[PDB]
Design a protein around this ligand. Structure first.
Ligand SMILES: Cn1cnc(Nc2nc(N3CCC(N)CC3)nc3ccc(Cl)cc23)c1
Length: 290
């Protein structure tokens, strides 16, 4: 479809106006696959917000931009990034949301070592959001540490909904190849129909991230790693001696090769590993204070 068709379709989902009329002090802070992320100040209030800016022309699959708006429009939740408004600015989609000042989880996993209290806090938050989203039928499809945002007081929120799909009683499975390689479930790689089970697989890879510091097969080129995930028996931990049988059994319920035997989010919410889950105050001493 032509650029003006997608532009018009966006003009019907987004809010009217030019947000440049009330945002100043833009500070680039990162890139995603979909665009860039800035800090800005609101002149009306002094409050800081994050603004995600996505170029319509620079988009492989333009139709995924609707997700950037629709998820956070309909899925307010204590463990989900909260959106305020979305706007169409020239040929860029802009999404204005809260500023989560504790950065992404990736900064913590590559630069510190988390205890099981902290791992459990992150997994509890992610699972709560995933059970709300899976219930009403949404698949995130890009679960990883880069998609997890924190605050100075250890609140954990799920982000980067650019890649979501929605499954229904009509179309129940889902066939497209999206997500980050090393974190992809194997049924997704061999390109069979899949459901929310993929998020659960990817959460398991995130746990390896929190334990070993990187996902399985991170040494290899992407394509090798994917075929590895399809052929191999599942990935065998490095720091296995640091992990309790609690975490070990949890993780074993995450990385089941067959998605029918793999635990649902709402099943994992009751696993005893999550009892270890420290409060928000437990994820303060590992951002930028060590
Ligand atoms: C939407 N949103 C709401 N708050 C945020 N905060 C942040 N997001 C990102 N990222 C952007 C590029 C990466 N792909 C993923 C992380 N990096 C940060 C680094 C330092 C600080 Cl202080 C905050 C952030 C984002």
């Amino acid at each position: 479809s032509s650029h003006e068709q997608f532009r018009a379709a966006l003009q019907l989902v987004v809010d009217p106006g030019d947000p440049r009329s009330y945002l100043d002090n833009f500070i680039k802070i990162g890139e995603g696959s979909t665009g860039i992320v800035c800090i800005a100040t609101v002149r009306s209030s002094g409050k800081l917000v994050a603004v995600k800016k996505m170029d319509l022309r620079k988009q492989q699959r333009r139709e995924l931009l609707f997700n950037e708006v629709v998820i956070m429009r309909d899925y307010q939740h204590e463990n989900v990034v909260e959106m305020y408004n979305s706007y169409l600015v020239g040929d860029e989609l802009w999404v204005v949301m809260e500023f989560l000042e504790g950065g992404a989880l990736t900064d913590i996993v590559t630069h510190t070592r988390m205890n099981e209290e902290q791992i459990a806090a992150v997994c509890l938050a992610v699972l709560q959001a995933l059970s709300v989203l899976h219930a009403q039928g949404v698949i995130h499809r890009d679960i990883k540490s880069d998609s997890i945002l924190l605050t100075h007081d250890g609140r954990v929120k799920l982000s980067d909904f650019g890649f979501c799909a929605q499954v229904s009683k009509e179309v129940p499975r889902r066939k497209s190849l999206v997500g980050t390689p090393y974190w992809m479930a194997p049924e997704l790689i061999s390109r069979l129909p899949y459901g929310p089970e993929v998020d659960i697989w990817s959460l398991g890879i995130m746990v390896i991230e929190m334990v070993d510091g990187e996902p399985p097969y991170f040494n290899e080129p992407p394509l090798k790693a994917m075929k590895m995930i399809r052929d191999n028996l599942p990935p065998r931990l490095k720091n296995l001696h640091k992990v309790s049988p609690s975490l070990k059994g949890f993780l074993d319920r995450l990385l089941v090769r067959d998605p029918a035997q793999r635990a649902t989010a709402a099943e994992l919410l009751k696993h005893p590993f999550l009892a270890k889950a420290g409060p928000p105050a437990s994820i303060v001493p590992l951002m930028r204070q060590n």
